[PDB]
Amino acid sequence: ETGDQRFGDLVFRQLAPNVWQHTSYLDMPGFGAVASNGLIVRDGGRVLVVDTAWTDDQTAQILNWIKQEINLPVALAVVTHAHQDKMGGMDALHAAGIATYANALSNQLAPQEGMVAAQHSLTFAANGWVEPATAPNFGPLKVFYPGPGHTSDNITVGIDGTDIAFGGCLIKDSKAKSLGNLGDADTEHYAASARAFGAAFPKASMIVMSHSAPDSRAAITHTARMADKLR
Ligand SMILES: O=C(O)c1ccccc1/C=N/n1c(S)nnc1-c1ccc(C(F)(F)F)cc1
Ligand SMILES: [Ca+2]
Ligand SMILES: [Ca+2]
Ligand SMILES: [Zn+2]
Ligand SMILES: [Zn+2]
């Protein structure tokens, strides 16, 4: 709590001199607020965003918070897979004139998932690293596709010059008792994908994820341990 800022429906937490976490909440009618996290990154004189909020209105609130608190232009956004918690606000980013980037497969699945596709598609080598020509001027964002897990399209992001990596919805916290909704999951490859994310970002000590508070690297090995049990 203490330290967090609220702006409309959203909550913001500073993780590092130039990195903040954004949290938005879906109101599940019977259940109440379900939190989802993304990241905001100040890169010199511009801002980069990872993930939308659940809805367009909430995504607009992120951008307005950036305008109010950082007052630097948002140069691009990258969304980490084609479900509502990470791509629900695409229309808001587009309306705001932010260039948007997603895994090619996310963009291909988006219509069927009821999401709006990003403008640009990222592609990935066999070793999981983004093909650099598809991610121009990403500054410190290092984008890595670990393999199928939470979904087949899930990607992850590390921030150069920080100790932070973002596992999105693939990674659960180190006290988690399950892997959550596995309805679109690849149960066979999940564990290796979790470990691959760990290997991509070997010096990250702060692991940020969609549905828990930032954790140590314990979150990675813990998720992989649970995932091992799906085979
Ligand atoms: O199941 C979990 O792991 C979990 C745990 C805790 C909080 C959220 C989630 C899952 N959120 N989520 C992911 S991750 N990908 N998609 C969705 C989603 C959820 C609801 C809707 C709906 F309610 F609005 F329909 C849509 C998407
Ligand atoms: Ca919409
Ligand atoms: Ca689905
Ligand atoms: Zn999902
Ligand atoms: Zn999620």
Side-chain angles (χ1 to χ4, degrees), residues 91-158:
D91 278 334
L93 299 183
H94 293 162
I98 300 156
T100 62
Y101 292 80
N103 189 351
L105 180 59
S106 301
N107 290 328
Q108 189 165 354
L109 290 166
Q112 253 189 106
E113 288 296 324
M115 303 291 117
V116 168
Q119 300 166 329
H120 305 282
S121 296
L122 304 177
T123 57
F124 296 93
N127 65 9
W129 287 105
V130 66
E131 298 263 4
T134 71
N137 291 317
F138 262 47
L141 293 196
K142 306 295 157 200
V143 184
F144 179 73
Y145 169 65
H150 169 71
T151 60
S152 54
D153 61 310
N154 55 21
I155 56 168
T156 60
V157 178

Side-chain angles (χ1 to χ4, degrees), residues 35-37 54 81 83 85-86 150 168-170 172 210-211:
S36 172
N37 304 316
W54 293 95
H81 74 279
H83 285 165
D85 59 345
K86 311 285 89 185
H150 169 71
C169 298
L170 173 73
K172 313 301 150 155
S210 291
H211 304 292

Side-chain angles (χ1 to χ4, degrees), residues 9-71:
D9 295 287
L10 278 259
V11 176
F12 299 86
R13 172 177 308 163
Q14 182 165 23
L15 294 189
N18 294 294
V19 181
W20 303 257
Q21 180 177 249
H22 67 78
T23 307
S24 58
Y25 303 85
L26 173 82
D27 57 355
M28 265 304 307
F31 297 73
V34 178
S36 172
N37 304 316
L39 287 180
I40 304 166
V41 176
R42 172 158 64 196
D43 171 45
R46 67 193 181 140
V47 171
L48 323 173
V49 169
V50 177
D51 287 343
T52 76
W54 293 95
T55 66
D56 292 308
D57 271 350
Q58 285 165 356
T59 302
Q61 295 176 20
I62 297 166
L63 295 178
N64 281 287
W65 179 94
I66 293 166
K67 181 53 186 68
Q68 180 170 281
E69 306 296 336
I70 307 171
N71 197 37

